């Protein structure tokens, strides 16, 4: 498509251009991630990423674990979802949420030294910082569930969460997260791999996160 060239990176997701060849609409359909399958071997893995069956050819970390269809037990039980969200990182151990599907209960049962992944995961959430921080437990739990690893906000020099307003003239929220793989040992070695997975979920219409995201990064 020739029309797709002008539509590239126009901050509008054009389904017509939502393909690997068109660069996922120049990141418009993949949360600004140029190529989530940057290092994946076999192509058409993105075509099999949206199913539930285990496709061993796309199971590699480079091929984004085939949306964890081979690892699994796959999703946190919807019946227990609200409980796990409310009891995430509350100081008290809730064993029923202590699984990779339900974000390991905010490491309440693993109180084990931290094994942080390389870098800082940066999310531009289309919510004001005040609204976001009120729903912090739910935000973290659901992200810690989708990424199958523990996630917490990066802290200031004073010890406060790194949640800042996005674009001061108007408004948007910049959320800086850290990935903890202490209960991991598949899993994410850095922030950019997790960013590519979130970007890949967007592209194949499989991202189930109730918080509207603008983009996803990986900075050191």
């Amino acid at each position, epitope marked *: 498509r020739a029309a797709c060239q002008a539509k590239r990176g126009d901050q*509008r997701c054009d389904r017509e251009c939502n393909s690997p060849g068109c660069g996922w609409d120049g990141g418009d359909c993949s949360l600004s991630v140029g190529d989530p399958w940057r290092q994946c071997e076999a192509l058409q893995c993105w075509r099999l990423f949206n199913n539930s069956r285990c496709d061993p050819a796309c199971s590699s970390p480079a091929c984004l674990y085939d949306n964890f269809d081979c690892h699994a037990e796959r999703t946190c039980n919807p019946v227990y979802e609200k409980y796990c969200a409310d009891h995430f990182a509350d100081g008290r151990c809730d064993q029923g949420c202590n699984t990779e599907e339900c974000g390991w209960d905010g490491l309440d049962c693993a109180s084990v030294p931290a094994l942080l992944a390389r870098g800082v995961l940066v999310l531009t959430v289309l919510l*004001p910082p005040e609204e976001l921080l009120r729903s912090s437990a739910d935000f973290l739990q659901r992200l810690s569930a989708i990424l199958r690893t523990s996630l917490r906000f990066r802290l200031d020099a004073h010890g406060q969460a790194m949640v800042f307003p996005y674009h001061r003239p108007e408004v948007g929220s910049v959320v800086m997260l850290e990935i903890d793989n202490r209960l991991c040992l598949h899993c994410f070695p850095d922030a950019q791999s997790a960013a590519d997975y979130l970007g890949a979920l967007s592209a194949v219409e499989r991202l189930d996160f109730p918080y509207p995201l603008r983009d996803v990064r990986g900075e050191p």
Partner: antibody
Amino acid sequence: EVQLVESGGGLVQPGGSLRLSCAASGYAFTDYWMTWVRQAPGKGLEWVAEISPNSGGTNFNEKFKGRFTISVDNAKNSLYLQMNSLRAEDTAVYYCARGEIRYNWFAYWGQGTLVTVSS
Amino acid sequence: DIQMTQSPSSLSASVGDRVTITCKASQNVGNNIAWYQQKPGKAPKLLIYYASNRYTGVPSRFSGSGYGTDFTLTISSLQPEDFATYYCQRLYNSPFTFGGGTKVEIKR
């Protein structure tokens, strides 16, 4: 504060043409997509088209491709809807709305302008 | 073209009642849905954006739920001002198709 004021509209002969104006203020015009929504008397809301003030890019509803035109003037922070070959069915209140980043939900809307297609 | 079917088309409830409005999409849209409130002769007002997020200033009684195709707008305790027409909207992808509309009338 964010403000959208739509000008134009009133009476137009069947088969005729009419241009509508939407004057934006209180925000960076180049940062958000602009939309046109119409509502027939008694009927529900209908999305017409959108325009990118930053790229000049357009997206349309198939039902309005060809006979309707969308345009911008960045200097005047304005958006325009040109309507040709107007039928009685085009009689509606035309609203201009600001599109929120990436998902296009509308928090800010214009007051609306009535367009009546009659001989 | 992905269709947006609202149910019911019209509803009549008393003040204090729990009102439930549904919007069903022909194909999967995920969390790409918004809810609007339109009062007679006035521009629509945004209530819920991205399936469940309540817009600033919207009272706590308004709630949004769902993922995929079946979405629900809930008014916990109906109020006399809540008399209006409610519309769902498909987000992210063009065309940004609005639902049929759901007129809420009040028993007095």
